[PDB]
Symmetry: C3
Subunit: 151 residues, 3 copies
């Protein structure tokens, strides 16, 4: 329903979000599959490994999505989207590592890079805003100075 | 802060999201009610159910808004309202397996993909129209 | 990507969101550190379990927080929403620390406040929409009767 110009600024970010959704579903399926071989949080050693891995991924996901969209909207879409893809590859390798484990946190540098893009984007906005208001006051001061000349 | 036309494109999705928040709160309250009193069977049941609901919420929200913004608001919002009904019955039944509302999520995913495909069709058609006019403008240039 | 006018309507909410990201990272670091005193599991030392549960309680709440923060910020008014969001990050920090040395829920009133803002904004949208619809009908009713000059 949104306009053509807006969608073009977010389409790549949407694609990566949607792929991350497929991955979320894959992780969730692996939890379901290992639970079947009533649902509890405790069980077989194999189940607890998958459940933990999934939980570790779920915990970090809203953070990832927040920095993905911040970076993609405020800074530049392509690099953010590419880093978003890189995150998903790292997620996959992290999750598979538990199916043998790695620690609690993963993909620190990608989240950091996306966070850095978001800060760079906010600084960029303010540089343009202060430039715009500096240009506005410059015209308004001249208009008062040039005021008697045009009569 | 947003303008009238944009809010009209999200208002239904926003309402559905707010109802889910109330539902999230209700589940959380239910945990708190049992927490103050692998522990007790009663507490473990509510905590796990809530935990399963919380786990899937970001994904739900991602595909709800993707579908609503990229494809069409009404069907996405309605499917979202259906998720909340299914989710309520899933949580109450605990007091099933790990996953619920599988098909609604899939449907919202398919809407999003259909919306992206729709975007690309309009884009490539627009650039073709641009090139078409540019061609005739070059052909009928000297006749002016 | 986004235009200067739009960013201006979301910059404060973005800032509050990025600080919550830093806070989430801080909490996750607190889980990572205590997990190395222990293969990663959910159950272990009383020190690890308390930090893990604390983080988990915050993580359970976070998507609801973002939902109400942005709804309030975009549909009602940016400044108070971001301010309320910033208060949530303060209360949340007090919650996490105190948990290591409160129950499951925290920051209810801020969540409720951001929720009510969102509802208030939606109602405000419908007030302006129906007024704009009635104004459009009012001009049409005059135009159709004045048409024979
Ligand atoms: O397992 C299937 O059949 C699929 C599937 C699985 C789940 C779906 O949505 C529910 C859902 C979604 C995300 C969640 C995240 C955390 C916890 C539960 C969650 N639950 C839809 C399709 C997957 C198989 C290969 C990729 C998709
Ligand atoms: O007093 C109460 O129980 C209410 C309440 C409860 C919580 C609130 O926000 C914090 C919050 C929000 C969502 C969460 C999701 C998961 C875990 C904790 C969460 N924590 C606000 C009002 C509920 C009463 C019926 C519905 C709301
Ligand atoms: O620990 C570091 O060195 C940083 C760092 C950098 C990137 C991280 O991942 C993103 C992330 C964000 C939130 C999460 C929530 C739950 C599980 C994983 C999560 N993962 C984490 C920490 C900072 C953390 C606070 C001060 C240092
Ligand atoms: Ca969780």
């Amino acid at each position: 329903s949104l306009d053509q110009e807006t969608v073009g600024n977010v389409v790549l970010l949407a694609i990566v979000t949607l792929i991350s959704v497929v991955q979320n579903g894959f992780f969730a399926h692996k939890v379901e599959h290992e639970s079947r071989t009533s649902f509890q949080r405790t069980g077989t050693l194999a189940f607890e490994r998958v459940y933990t891995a999934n939980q570790n991924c779920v915990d970090a996901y809203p953070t990832f999505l927040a920095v993905l969209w911040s970076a993609g909207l405020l800074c530049s879409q392509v690099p953010a989207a590419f880093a978003g893809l890189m995150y998903l590859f790292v997620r996959q390798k992290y999750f598979v590592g538990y199916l043998g484990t790695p620690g609690y946190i993963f993909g620190k540098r990608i989240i950091l890079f996306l966070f850095l893009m978001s800060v760079a984007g906010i600084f960029n906005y303010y540089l343009i805003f202060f430039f715009g208001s500096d240009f506005e006051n410059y015209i308004a001061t001249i208009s008062t100075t040039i005021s008697p000349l045009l009569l």
